[PDB]
Amino acid sequence: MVILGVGYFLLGLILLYYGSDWFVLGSERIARHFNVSNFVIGATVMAIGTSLPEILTSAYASYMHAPGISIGNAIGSCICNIGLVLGLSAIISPIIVDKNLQKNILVYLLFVIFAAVIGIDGFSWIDGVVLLILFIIYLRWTVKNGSAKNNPSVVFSLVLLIIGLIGVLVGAELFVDGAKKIALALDISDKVIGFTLVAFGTSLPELMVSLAAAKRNLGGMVLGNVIGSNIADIGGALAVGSLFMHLPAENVQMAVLVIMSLLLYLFAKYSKIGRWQGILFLALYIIAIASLRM
Ligand SMILES: CCCCCCCC/C=C\CCCCCCCC(=O)OC[C@H](O)CO
Ligand SMILES: CCCCCCCCCCCCCCC
Ligand SMILES: [Ca+2]
Ligand SMILES: [Ca+2]
């Protein structure tokens, strides 16, 4: 304790920093290998790999019969990806969305609006089955319109990707396990200074990765990672949670998510996603974490 905490906390940070860059660089090479856009590889492989925390957290929480945590973490992640993650990235590297990716973003918007409507009375296991299938359909529709021996260039790409993903997922855990151990060693522990850490802990992979890609001017990869993770949270994390137990209705946050998603579409179609658009997202996020709950 106390001293393994500092060790775990910053070592996890080291793995998050370098792991994100490796995961980003590895994905960018894979995308060029399979002849797909950076958006696509971010909306799929990267998004799912980074949304694995939410999925396993929602499943565990719902099964341990705390479905409030399940949906709370899922929607809290979506809001965080648009407000915080996309907010920081847009400022770092402004994005002018092409006419093709606007179509993917509008589809994302419809998916989110649909989730919000069927979630008013909560999320039944049937609701989850529906969202999970749309999730699969989205992944395939996204890959198709972005598509078309022992190559050492491909192998090196896959290693960077996998080691990078391991780096950010383990790194997010050490960060999480390190901060938790510090608080208890210092007796300052509360347990929504409890489910504060993993709500943010699950979003650390998306954050660092998108920051990494933003440093390399990969706006498409960042945007894809944001869109994909959110869908992977609703159609993936939220869905699995409903399979174990009915999820309580979070209508306030859904409205917030719908509003942020609507804005994201509008900016992508008629404007750009740069400095002042990113500033708005951050402000909304800061208001959200200053006014919301659960
Ligand atoms: C608005 C704050 C709601 C706080 C929670 C209790 C609300 C009352 C419970 C049932 C009444 C009808 C609730 C209707 C909720 C509609 C959907 C919504 O609020 O989210 C965005 C919408 O789906 C985009 O189309
Ligand atoms: C590919 C994953 C498929 C998951 C299907 C989960 C079905 C869960 C059904 C739970 C039923 C609980 C009792 C309802 C009366
Ligand atoms: Ca995540
Ligand atoms: Ca429902």
CA of 233 to the centre of ligand 4 (A): 17
Tell me how far CA of residue 82 lies from CA of 7, 30, 118, 129, 281, in angstroms.
31, 25, 22, 25, 7
What's the token pair of residue 1? 């304790």
Residue range 1-35+150-189 in CATH 1.10.3720.10:
no
Q: Are 67 and 195 in contact (CB under 8 A)?
A: no
Which residues is 106 bridged to in the sheet?
A: none
Q: Are 203 and 233 in contact (CB under 8 A)?
A: no
Note the CATH number of domain 36-149+190-294: 1.20.1420.30
| Domain spans of the chain, in order of start | 1-35+150-189, 36-149+190-294
Closest listed ligand to the CA of 239: 2
Closest listed ligand to the CA of 240: 2
Residues 271 and 240: their CA atoms lie apart, in Å, by 36
What's the token pair of residue 75? 């929607």
SS (H, E, C) the chain: CCHHHHHHHHHHHHHHHHHHHHHHHHHHHHHHHCCCCHHHHHHHHHHHHHHHHHHHHHHHHHHCCCHHHHHHHHHHHHHHHHHHHHHHHHHHCCECCCHHHHHHHHHHHHHHHHHHHHCCCCECHHHHHHHHHHHHHHHHHHHHCCCCCCCHHHHHHHHHHHHHHHHHHHHHHHHHHHHHHHHHHCCCCCCCCCCCHHHHHCCHHHHHHHHHHHHCCCHHHHHHHHHHHHHHHHHHHHHHHHHHCCECCCHHHHHHHHHHHHHHHHHHHHCCECHHHHHHHHHHHHHHHHHCCC
Query: 251 CB less than 6 Å from ligand 1?
Result: yes
Q: Are 254 and 71 in contact (CB under 8 A)?
A: no
Resolution in Å, one decimal place: 2.7
CA of 121 to the centre of ligand 4 (A): 4
Residues 43 and 48: their CA atoms lie apart, in Å, by 8
At residue 247, φ and ψ (nearest 5 deg) are -90, 130
Residues 95 and 86: their CA atoms lie apart, in Å, by 11
Q: Which method, experimentally, gave rise to this model?
A: X-ray
What's the token pair of residue 157? 């790409």
At residue 95, φ and ψ (nearest 5 deg) are -120, 130
